[PDB]
Ligand binder design. Structure first.
Ligand SMILES: [Mg+2]
Ligand SMILES: [Mg+2]
Ligand SMILES: [Mg+2]
Ligand SMILES: [Mg+2]
Ligand SMILES: [Mg+2]
Ligand SMILES: [Mg+2]
Ligand SMILES: [Mg+2]
Ligand SMILES: [Mg+2]
Ligand SMILES: [Mg+2]
Ligand SMILES: [Mg+2]
Ligand SMILES: [Mg+2]
Ligand SMILES: [Mg+2]
Ligand SMILES: [Mg+2]
Ligand SMILES: [Mg+2]
Ligand SMILES: [Mg+2]
Ligand SMILES: [Mg+2]
Ligand SMILES: [Mg+2]
Ligand SMILES: [Mg+2]
Ligand SMILES: [Mg+2]
Ligand SMILES: [Mg+2]
Ligand SMILES: [Mg+2]
Ligand SMILES: [Mg+2]
Ligand SMILES: [Mg+2]
Ligand SMILES: [Mg+2]
Ligand SMILES: [Mg+2]
Ligand SMILES: [Mg+2]
Ligand SMILES: [Mg+2]
Ligand SMILES: [Mg+2]
Ligand SMILES: [Mg+2]
Ligand SMILES: [Mg+2]
Ligand SMILES: [Mg+2]
Ligand SMILES: [Mg+2]
Ligand SMILES: [Mg+2]
Ligand SMILES: [Mg+2]
Ligand SMILES: [Mg+2]
Ligand SMILES: [Mg+2]
Ligand SMILES: [Mg+2]
Ligand SMILES: [Mg+2]
Ligand SMILES: [Mg+2]
Ligand SMILES: [Mg+2]
Ligand SMILES: [Mg+2]
Ligand SMILES: [Mg+2]
Ligand SMILES: [Mg+2]
Ligand SMILES: [Mg+2]
Ligand SMILES: [Mg+2]
Ligand SMILES: [Mg+2]
Ligand SMILES: [Mg+2]
Ligand SMILES: [Mg+2]
Ligand SMILES: [Mg+2]
Ligand SMILES: [Mg+2]
Ligand SMILES: [Mg+2]
Ligand SMILES: [Mg+2]
Ligand SMILES: [Mg+2]
Ligand SMILES: [Mg+2]
Ligand SMILES: [Mg+2]
Ligand SMILES: [Mg+2]
Ligand SMILES: [Mg+2]
Ligand SMILES: [Mg+2]
Ligand SMILES: [Mg+2]
Ligand SMILES: [Mg+2]
Ligand SMILES: [Mg+2]
Ligand SMILES: [Mg+2]
Ligand SMILES: [Mg+2]
Ligand SMILES: [Mg+2]
Ligand SMILES: [Mg+2]
Ligand SMILES: [Mg+2]
Ligand SMILES: [Mg+2]
Ligand SMILES: [Mg+2]
Ligand SMILES: [Mg+2]
Ligand SMILES: [Mg+2]
Ligand SMILES: [Mg+2]
Ligand SMILES: [Mg+2]
Ligand SMILES: [Mg+2]
Ligand SMILES: [Mg+2]
Ligand SMILES: [Mg+2]
Ligand SMILES: [Mg+2]
Lengths: 101, 87, 116, 70
RNA sequence: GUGGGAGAGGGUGGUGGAAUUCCCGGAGUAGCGGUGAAAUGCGCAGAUACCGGGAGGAACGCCGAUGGCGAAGGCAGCCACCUGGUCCACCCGUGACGCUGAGGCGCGAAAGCGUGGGGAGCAAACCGGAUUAGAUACCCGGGUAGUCCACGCCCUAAACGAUGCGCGCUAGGUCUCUGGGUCUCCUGGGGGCCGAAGCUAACGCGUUAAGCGCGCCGCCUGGGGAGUACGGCCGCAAGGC
C-alpha cells in the first residue's frame, strides 16, 4: 500500500444536511476500497480562478490516505459519480521538495 | 512491481551459502522472476513493444548464464533447471 | 430607444477588415459598423483610415442611445487596430478600460496551409 | 528587475495547493514565466511547471487571462 | 547485491482548459469573406461582429531549452496503474560467465491496403473563381479519400551524424543536463562549442575521432541502360527484397 492525497472540490451551495451526507458518502466509499486515513485539511469556500460548473467558487477537501495501489482508479471512478462532486484529483504523495533553501 | 520483501525471499532461497548475492544460481533465479513478471505484463498489453525489447534481453542474459553453468558444473545446472522448471 | 449610457466596444481587427460592435454591459450589442458599412468596398476596408471611420460611425450610433462610458475589447492583429482605438478615445465616448482578448488556441486545430 | 526566487522565502516547489506563492510565478496572463524571470534552476523549473498545471486543474491557478493595456 | 537518482522511454484506463466547426437562445443591421487587385462563395429563410447554453472531434499554448528519453522509427496537458532502459555511491557476491554476428525472429515515420467504427479542423483527386500567351500550377472559394480509433497487412525513406558495434590508448579550454563528493572546485554519466598531437584531396575531424591499434559484421570496384529485364521469395493489392 502506497500513500496518496485525495483532492475533492464540491458545489459551494450546500446546506448542512447535504454537505454532511456528501462527506459521509466519501467516508463510506473510502472504507469500501480499504483506504486508511492519516490526516485531513478542510479548506472550504475558495475563490476559483475560472468558473467550474458555472459557479465562481468551490468547496475544498484534502485527504492523506494509505490504500492499496491497484484500487486507486476504482476509487476515483466511485467518487466522481455524485453530482455535487466536481473535481477529483488523486496524487501520489511526494517528499516536500524545498526551494530557495 | 517487485518489492525487496519478495526479492530477499528469492535470494535467500537460491544462495549457495548465506551472504551469497551474485552466484549464477542467484542471478538466474532473480532473472527468472523478472521474466515471468514481464511476460504476464505482456500477456495483456500486447502492443507494448518497447518493454518487450527488455524481455528479449533478460532472456538472452539468462541463457548465457545457463550456457555457462552447463559447461562448468552440469550437475548444478540440472538442479537449477528442475527447480525453476525451464527448458 | 434603450438609454444604456455605459457598455462595451469590441474591436475586431483582421488584415482584411476592421469592424466594431458596441454592446450593453452584459454583452448584447446595440449598434455596429465596419470598413464596409462606411463607403469602402475592397482592400480599402483593411486600411487604418477605414478602421477610424468605422469606430467613429459605431460611436455616433451609440450616442443616439445615449452612451457615454465604454470598456474597449480588442481582438486580432490588423492594420488600424491601434488607429481604431485612437478614434474611440477621441470620439467623445469616455474610454473606461482597454483589454486585448485575442483568442489564441492551445494548439488544437490544424491551420489552413496559408497559416503554416 | 528582480527575479521571483530572489524575492521569496523558503517554499515548497511541490505543493500544488499554495496559491499565494504559485500566483507569483504566473504572468499578467496565466502564462508560466521563463527561467529568465523565475530565477529557477533547470530542475526546479520542471517541477514548477508540473505543480502549476496541477493547481490549474484544481481551479486555483488560471489557464489564461486578459491583458489590461494597449 | 545493496542503497539512491533523472527522464515528452513504452502500454492501459481516466481526465482538464483554450480554440475551430455545428445546433439552441438572446441582442443586433448590410454586409461578411478574400486578394497584388479581384471574382466564385456566404448573407433579408437575418450572415458577419457580441453575450449565454449545448454537442462533437482532433491537438496540447505558456513551461520549452542551443534541454531530456529511446536501439532505431520515434516520444510533449494532468492524473493513476502496469512496465522497459539507464546512471551514480558502497567494493558486498559470482569468477572470463566476454566481443561481434551470415541465417533466423521481433520493431520499423509518412503514405498506402482490408474489415468495422469515427469524422471538428485540414485536405490528394475533383468542382469552381482568378492569373496567364496558355494554367492540366503557384493565389482564392468549396471538397472526397485520407488524416483520428480498433484489429490485421504493407517494410519503404535525405529511416542522416549521409559517419556499423565493442574495447584500449592519445593536450586542454568553455557552455550545459544529471548523479556523488572533504561543494572557488573535485569526480563520474550524457549533450554542445573551440582547439594539442595526429589524420584528411579539401572542407573539415579532433577523449561524443574522421587520431592510434585490435576483433567481428555489412558494403564498394567508371557513367548511361537500371533498381530495369528474367528467375525466385514475400504481398489481398500497391509493391518490396
Ligand atoms: Mg460528478
Ligand atoms: Mg478587404
Ligand atoms: Mg497551433
Ligand atoms: Mg495535424
Ligand atoms: Mg496543430
Ligand atoms: Mg505563417
Ligand atoms: Mg486566422
Ligand atoms: Mg501564428
Ligand atoms: Mg505570423
Ligand atoms: Mg507552422
Ligand atoms: Mg506561423
Ligand atoms: Mg551490502
Ligand atoms: Mg511517458
Ligand atoms: Mg504514455
Ligand atoms: Mg497516455
Ligand atoms: Mg442565432
Ligand atoms: Mg453582393
Ligand atoms: Mg464563406
Ligand atoms: Mg460554404
Ligand atoms: Mg441571398
Ligand atoms: Mg447571393
Ligand atoms: Mg458560443
Ligand atoms: Mg458532431
Ligand atoms: Mg498558439
Ligand atoms: Mg505557439
Ligand atoms: Mg517552444
Ligand atoms: Mg512547444
Ligand atoms: Mg531535441
Ligand atoms: Mg540519449
Ligand atoms: Mg528525427
Ligand atoms: Mg523504471
Ligand atoms: Mg571483491
Ligand atoms: Mg573467490
Ligand atoms: Mg578457468
Ligand atoms: Mg540479423
Ligand atoms: Mg528465434
Ligand atoms: Mg511502418
Ligand atoms: Mg500511416
Ligand atoms: Mg484504412
Ligand atoms: Mg478548408
Ligand atoms: Mg484548396
Ligand atoms: Mg506569361
Ligand atoms: Mg499525420
Ligand atoms: Mg529521421
Ligand atoms: Mg556517397
Ligand atoms: Mg542508405
Ligand atoms: Mg571506448
Ligand atoms: Mg552537488
Ligand atoms: Mg563529457
Ligand atoms: Mg571558444
Ligand atoms: Mg573562433
Ligand atoms: Mg578564438
Ligand atoms: Mg595540426
Ligand atoms: Mg589542411
Ligand atoms: Mg583550415
Ligand atoms: Mg571542431
Ligand atoms: Mg582516457
Ligand atoms: Mg574510438
Ligand atoms: Mg546491395
Ligand atoms: Mg558499365
Ligand atoms: Mg549522365
Ligand atoms: Mg545517375
Ligand atoms: Mg542522367
Ligand atoms: Mg535518364
Ligand atoms: Mg542506376
Ligand atoms: Mg538513375
Ligand atoms: Mg530512366
Ligand atoms: Mg552497372
Ligand atoms: Mg524502387
Ligand atoms: Mg534469370
Ligand atoms: Mg518479379
Ligand atoms: Mg501471390
Ligand atoms: Mg492500380
Ligand atoms: Mg500506379
Ligand atoms: Mg516504388
Ligand atoms: Mg516497379
Amino acid at each position: 500500500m502506497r500513500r496518496y492525497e485525495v483532492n475533492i472540490v464540491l458545489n459551494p451551495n450546500l446546506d448542512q444536511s447535504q454537505l454532511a451526507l456528501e462527506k459521509e458518502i466519501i467516508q463510506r466509499a473510502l472504507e469500501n476500497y480499504g483506504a486508511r486515513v492519516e490526516k485531513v485539511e478542510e479548506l472550504g469556500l475558495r475563490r476559483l480562478a475560472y468558473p467550474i460548473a458555472k459557479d465562481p467558487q468551490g468547496y475544498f477537501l484534502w485527504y492523506q490516505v494509505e490504500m492499496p495501489e491497484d484500487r486507486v482508479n476504482d476509487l476515483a471512478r466511485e467518487l466522481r459519480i455524485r453530482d455535487n462532486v466536481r473535481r477529483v484529483m488523486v496524487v501520489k504523495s511526494q517528499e516536500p521538495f524545498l526551494a530557495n533553501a | 512491481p517487485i518489492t525487496k520483501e519478495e526479492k530477499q525471499k528469492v535470494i535467500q532461497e537460491f544462495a549457495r551459502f548465506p551472504g551469497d548475492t551474485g552466484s549464477t544460481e542467484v542471478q538466474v533465479a532473480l532473472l527468472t522472476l523478472r521474466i515471468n513478471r514481464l511476460s504476464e505484463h505482456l500477456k495483456v498489453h500486447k502492443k507494448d513493444h518497447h518493454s518487450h525489447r527488455g524481455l528479449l534481453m533478460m532472456v538472452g542474459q539468462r541463457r548465457r548464464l545457463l550456457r555457462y553453468l552447463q559447461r562448468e558444473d552440469p550437475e548444478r545446472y540440472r538442479a537449477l533447471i528442475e527447480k525453476l522448471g525451464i527448458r | 430607444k434603450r438609454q444604456v449610457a455605459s457598455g462595451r466596444a469590441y474591436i475586431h481587427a483582421s488584415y482584411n477588415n476592421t469592424i466594431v460592435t458596441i454592446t450593453d454591459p452584459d454583452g448584447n450589442p446595440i449598434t455596429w459598423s465596419s470598413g464596409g458599412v462606411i463607403g469602402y468596398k475592397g482592400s480599402r476596408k483593411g486600411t487604418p483610415y477605414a478602421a477610424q471611420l468605422a469606430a467613429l460611425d459605431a460611436a455616433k450610433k451609440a450616442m443616439a442611445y445615449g452612451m457615454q462610458s465604454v470598456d474597449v475589447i480588442v481582438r486580432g492583429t490588423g492594420a488600424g487596430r491601434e488607429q481604431a482605438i485612437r478614434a474611440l478615445q477621441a470620439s467623445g465616448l469616455q474610454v473606461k478600460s482597454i483589454v486585448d482578448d485575442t483568442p489564441v488556441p492551445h494548439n488544437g486545430c490544424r491551420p489552413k496551409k496559408k497559416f503554416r | 528587475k528582480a527575479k521571483v526566487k530572489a524575492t521569496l522565502g523558503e517554499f515548497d516547489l511541490r505543493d500544488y495547493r499554495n496559491v499565494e506563492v504559485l500566483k507569483r510565478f504566473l504572468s499578467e496572463t496565466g502564462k508560466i514565466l521563463p527561467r529568465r524571470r523565475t530565477g529557477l534552476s533547470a530542475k526546479e523549473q520542471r517541477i514548477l511547471a508540473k505543480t502549476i498545471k496541477r493547481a490549474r486543474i484544481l481551479g486555483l491557478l488560471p489557464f489564461t487571462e486578459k491583458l489590461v493595456r494597449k
